[PDB]
Amino acid sequence: MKIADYGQLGEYTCDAKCDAEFGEPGNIRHLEGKTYDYRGVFCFNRKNLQEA
């Protein structure tokens, strides 16, 4: 997971007002990755390898 944002909630308001507003809530994101592979191959000649 990752917390992208927290958002804004609440504000200072005039006392005479009798209600309040809705803010803009934050955002959360789901992320994922991957794993990679390394490979190779090599070959020999038996007699040459044995006599070297």
Add this chain to the structure above:
Amino acid sequence: MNFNVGVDFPSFIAWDGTTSFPVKIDGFNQFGFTFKVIEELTADVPFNIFYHEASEADPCVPGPAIRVPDVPFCDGVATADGLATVVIPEAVAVDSFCAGSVPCFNGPWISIAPVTVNADSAKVQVTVTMKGATR
């Protein structure tokens, strides 16, 4: 102190830039080439490898040229036509030498010549080295 190295490891001209000379490898059980340049090159120059065998009229003169066959290695690509060749890279410097040899013997004589004779093929020199005389 140096030695008479030519006693044990003689070398013979194989291409002087204008003509190709057959070389005898009968009495030596190993051999290889050596390449050198004398001027800046304009493009790659490929070569063909041939082998000969005893002529009919005399056992000490080579016959007509027979193109060498390819031999794929332990595991790897094979030539598009199944015949051995050597390609000299363009980047080769004047003060350097290149060495390479074929894996198989075939006939008792060997030869080499460029694919096309031109002003660029005259800038190379090829020499063959022997080893291990058997007589």
